[PDB]
């Protein structure tokens, strides 16, 4: 994907994702309940948008999702076994 | 002395630079009349929504934004003003703005940065903190943080010619996301997919979001 410069401080996850999707200028759409009451360590630096979103989501229990159109979503982290 | 009238079409954002160097961005379907005189730099927001940025730093006259509901007097401020049918909403990002409701102009209500307030001619209607540093529309985006679906689609419809609605059973569903304004059809489709809704679109200018059956 493309890259963007991010300067997102640590804090509650939901406002951080509002900031992320604006800094990346992306269509990001996901269920409100999924991100309520979670937190992020933030994201500061230049990153590919997909890698930056995964870093923002570290520790949250969520991962980024994408489909056939250029939009992004979020989902509970995939089981690995 | 300098005057001008401006308007933006549905779906249009416009950048103006006023005679003093103050920058104004007009959002969709907006109308602004400007009248500078010896007393004041007068902006009249007749319809819609605008962002004032880069205020002139050393003009001796105050900057006044008036709507039918009252006056916003700017002290070096960067701020958004949106006119609704029954109130005006101001959001301050830098500096401070004095709100003077038409029928209760004194004492002014001081809004500092990170504050948003709605008022009518009578006075304040709501007031809250905001973390935004600029309105999302001014960077070509809509941003929703748990916004009720009915209110989200009211906002999005401002950018489109046709009618956009949701079934009443859906009116409070919370919308979260960021949405580039470049393609509003994509916004509708993405929100409907996230909320597991059907998009009824039987005539070009009438779109209803409905429960999946």
Numbering used by the authors:
A (entry chain B): 48 to 128
B (entry chain R): 111 to 323
The paper states:
Here, we report the 1.56 Å resolution X-ray crystal structure of the periplasmic domain of the CSS sigma regulator, PupR, in complex with the NTSD of the transducer, PupB, revealing a unique fold and topological arrangement of domains. The CCSSD comprises two subdomains: residues 110–238 that we call the C-terminal juxta-membrane subdomain (CJM) and residues 250–324, comprising a Secretin/TonB, short N-terminal subdomain (STN). The CJM has a novel-fold, whereas the STN is structurally homologous to the PupB NTSD.
The Se-Met and native proteins have practically identical structures, although there are some differences in interacting residues at the complex interface. In the native crystal structure, the Nϵ2 of the His72 imidazole ring forms a salt bridge with Glu292 Oϵ1 and Oϵ2. The Glu292 side chain adopts a different conformer with the closest atom, Oϵ2, shifting 4.7 Å from His72.
